[PDB]
Symmetry: D2
Subunit: 356 residues, 4 copies
Amino acid sequence: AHRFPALTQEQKKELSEIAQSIVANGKGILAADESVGTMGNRLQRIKVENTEENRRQFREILFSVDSSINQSIGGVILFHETLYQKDSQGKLFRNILKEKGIVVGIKLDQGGAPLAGTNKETTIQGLDGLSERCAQYKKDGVDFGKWRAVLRIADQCPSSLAIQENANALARYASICQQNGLVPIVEPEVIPDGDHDLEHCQYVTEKVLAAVYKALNDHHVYLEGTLLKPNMVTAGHACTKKYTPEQVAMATVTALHRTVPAAVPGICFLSGGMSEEDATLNLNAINLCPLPKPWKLSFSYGRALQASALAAWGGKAANKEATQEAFMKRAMANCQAAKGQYVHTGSSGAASTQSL
Amino acid sequence: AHRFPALTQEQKKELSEIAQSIVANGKGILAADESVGTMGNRLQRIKVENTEENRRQFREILFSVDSSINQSIGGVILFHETLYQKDSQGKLFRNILKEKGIVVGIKLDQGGAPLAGTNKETTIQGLDGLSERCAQYKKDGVDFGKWRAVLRIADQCPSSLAIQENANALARYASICQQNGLVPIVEPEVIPDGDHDLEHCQYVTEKVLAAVYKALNDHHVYLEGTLLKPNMVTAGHACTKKYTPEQVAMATVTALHRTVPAAVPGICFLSGGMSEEDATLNLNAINLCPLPKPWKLSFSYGRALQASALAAWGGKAANKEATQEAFMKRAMANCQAAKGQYVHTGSSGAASTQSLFTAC
Amino acid sequence: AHRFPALTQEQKKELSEIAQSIVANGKGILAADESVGTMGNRLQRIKVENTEENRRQFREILFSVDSSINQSIGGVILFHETLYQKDSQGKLFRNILKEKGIVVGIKLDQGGAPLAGTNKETTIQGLDGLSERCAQYKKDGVDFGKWRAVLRIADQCPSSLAIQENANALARYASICQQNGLVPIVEPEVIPDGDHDLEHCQYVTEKVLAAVYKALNDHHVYLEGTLLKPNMVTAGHACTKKYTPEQVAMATVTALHRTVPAAVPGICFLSGGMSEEDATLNLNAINLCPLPKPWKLSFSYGRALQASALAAWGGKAANKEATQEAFMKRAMANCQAAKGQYVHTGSS
Amino acid sequence: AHRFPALTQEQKKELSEIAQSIVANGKGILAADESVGTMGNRLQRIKVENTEENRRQFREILFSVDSSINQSIGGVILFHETLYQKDSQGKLFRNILKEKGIVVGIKLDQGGAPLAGTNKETTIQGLDGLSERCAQYKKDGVDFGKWRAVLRIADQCPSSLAIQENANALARYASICQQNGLVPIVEPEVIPDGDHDLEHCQYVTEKVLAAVYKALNDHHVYLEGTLLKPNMVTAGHACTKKYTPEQVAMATVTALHRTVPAAVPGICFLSGGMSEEDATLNLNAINLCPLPKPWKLSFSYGRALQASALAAWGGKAANKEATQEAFMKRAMANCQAAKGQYVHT
């Protein structure tokens, strides 16, 4: 509250410049910020032991790919550890990435915490000392952050305490990052677990984005210097009905265009477990849906950009190339999807049609 | 909650089609819904008695204008009296408007009500009976409604209680229109009274808007089936900073693109006191503002479409012609401005250059 | 707003007096404000034609009772019509009651209205013109008002929209009434329909009270000048478990002590549906419940104070005495219950 | 959810019992949870070097006072370092207190954070990982917590954002304490800084509290196992109008009874800034105030119980008895004031 402006014109100019730079010409985001535990889950699928070193090795293969990768990839979100890791010749990754023209980002949330008196719902931690962490990250070469909330549809979820309380941690999160020069990505993911259908997700997704944006305003957040990583709108995991990229597209741009201000510059979708192929086909329909779409509609993918590469790697140095090839192909595909230019092409083996 | 949808797909299709038809090709709205008191203030300016007959005569001139007016005017908001008045031959005004291909709206709000413990802030009455009233008006040829809220800037204004309550009332109101096939026009006006500058206005307006839409969302309103009639972002009346349309537009378009969703099909500005030429220069500047503009940006003009015609009328039937040319001239200019093409020469036309219409 | 006080010290004094006057000493509230249709449902039970004369005749009997009765009833809520009716002699009922020592109140809401996009939830209508209406009633010798909201437990009810919207209308009405000297009686009723149990209603009643209060607070309503008429914590109508007055008391005072500020002078249960005997025992248990109870706990009953009286009247003049007797009886039981005396042991 | 209870009845039962036992018979709380910096200020006053030794030493005099202080003091708020500090004989202070029948509490908040876009307003940090800390503290002898939010009166403060956000932080914290068997003392202080008068402070005190309690209600906090530590209502510090204890009381009780729920078992007024005597007089009055008072009304004082003792100590070990005397004296005065039985003489 009121008068007493959160930011200078200059601060805004910087954050709006970073933000627009990452989704600039069909480019997207590679989401490599899996934590120790989450990355172990990934490495498990290819039966690779979750070691720091293995983690360092897979990331180094992805980050050392030809600078051309700049033409699909606008930023890369890193987990803390990886932010401080290095190459073979300790070139820190973060500098391998900045030098190729890629903007570096950082996971700033520190996970869930249960919210008592609720059907298993949570909020997210990490606001304590966030300012000071953001400043050091700004110093170490980071220009955007990521904060993920997780909301479920189930008996009595997403509760109100749940949507408002996760919308306000997001809003504090967003507020602090801006005071430090980082563009905040607000991730209010609504989890595809369960058997609801398309309309149900569409509705919850609309009620969750309306909360976020009003919280977001109550806390004086600067929409122009922010990015949204929403869930696309689909039926749940256990839904038996079958849907089309085009139906996911309508439901998804419908929901957004009723709740996401045109000032937000770019909307980069989470892929969450869709196969790589669907991730791409869906984003591509999203860019051709015949509705008002005032922002860039792009990707911030984690699994949809790294499954087939993980699989080609299998933890063997010897696979460097195949690993590289995979990620590059997914990366290009999502760039065309980002421009509504993708045509069923791209990666084809079971891992692209995988499901995650 | 949820899975209790408020509208069917076919009700949505109808409100969306209505709502877009009104702002379709640079068109705008003529806001002729001044109540008796308000209208009295207007006619007082031209020293004409505020008679139900004087009122019916000045509106007869305006609506009997050449057909071509439907190139500029996509809809016309009427005050209850007027919705039931007649031409000089017993032909109903609402039927004349409707045959010339112009959508008819009706003022649904019923004035303010003081908010106790507030520094002179109000809310707006009109929801009791609202449904039974829209139903009937729909039957009577009406396809859209208008509800005006009034917020001001001042010591302890606009408060949370006032913003909150006026958004909710707006909320109920838009809900109810939608259930009866009327497209709600939502007008949370921020008045220009006072000396704040543009930056302050812009901030209150972003504040007001964000509450409005979250509220409409709580109430399940169908945005696609709505129109928004807000104030342009300007300095207060008594502020002394002088600004440029272009400054006006940057503030306006900035605020609106951070709170009004892209699903709203059009936003028709009230002109609230701005000279006829200024309401034209501004709207025009808003259409060329280099920011995202997902929605039509047009006019819904009370005074700014009528100053000149009133003055020409003088309350004399022999002035019919002049009266109609004034009206038509501002209706066309406005529609060009709604398309970012009004390259007025600064207007000459005192009528058009002066403050406006027992305003304050 | 922020300074800009709602009311003066004197308005306050006035309203605070009204408020405490009506629940002053064990007494309670006769809710005779049934509406035309509602009142006819009551007449239908005893097979009497809903007619304005039938209605004026019934109340006439209830209001002509032995003065006394200002030692149990401290206020009587009337439906508009009844406010301007007479007795079999032009005496205006509103004068008969004043002169008996009883505060007369008016129903100010105007029934429900559907909230689109809800599972059949409603709001209430009535604020348009309320202010004007309030001024005249105050001038016609009404000192307090009543507005009922209805909330229900059901698939996705009560919704947050429902609760929020109902609490705000209630806050508008309550602010409005003070501005014209009535003390507003805030009635957010959680209907018993359905099969939920006690603890489900407790939870839903404690959430609805938190809402209303919060709103009253936003609307700068003067609580010390108010009165509440909440439902009692009970299992739903279709619940098959069975419970004890004392179990309804604990459920009820628990909820109320967690949400209704000690500044509200009195909370006056509605009974809607409970037999005459139960509304007296539960109120009674309510007053014996061992929690902290900063406010008077009492009744503001409609059926529970009249059902037997109607039965006795039968719409027959001849039945007058029987009729008053009954009403006079239930009114003492509940005064005594209001004091936690009512040694109970079943009455009529 | 809704339904899906936050606590079992057992859990309630314990939090309830702990909550009441602290305010049990006119008893109150010694707040010795000043941080290293704050304590520094207080020692600055008697001219003693802010030293963990000094700190440690000064508290050791207050906690070794005769057991009879448990007639007046129901619990003590410690700051982290101190929760693990020992006497001159290696006996941990918390055990010394626990053995004289005093319940021990831990500061949980972690200070302030700037709320951009506000006129100097803040929120409070400390929720990250708070649960695992709660549990740890529970295992180290702790039974209740403490979280201080600060609001002030000034140009555009306290704002909606400040209000709502501190309320939400308070709610969360309260909730997480309950989940781990501590009783959360909610502390929404309205700072006295500034020129405002009585009625103003009372108006903000009422808005802050209605916000505090609805948010605890959104967050399923169980009030019967909570305590509230609010400011009393008084004019601001630079306000020239003089007022009587009776005036402070009517304004404090008026506010409190309009917003704080009768379930809350006890309300323990911070005194911030009040002289020891004024803190006793005003609490006393508060207890005679002729309005409904469903809750004990006591103290949770820091300066008000230690000023005279600190001056007597003078950082001189030889002043051990004077030092304890003073402290003991205010603790009894406040205990009487918590029973509206204090009189000067």
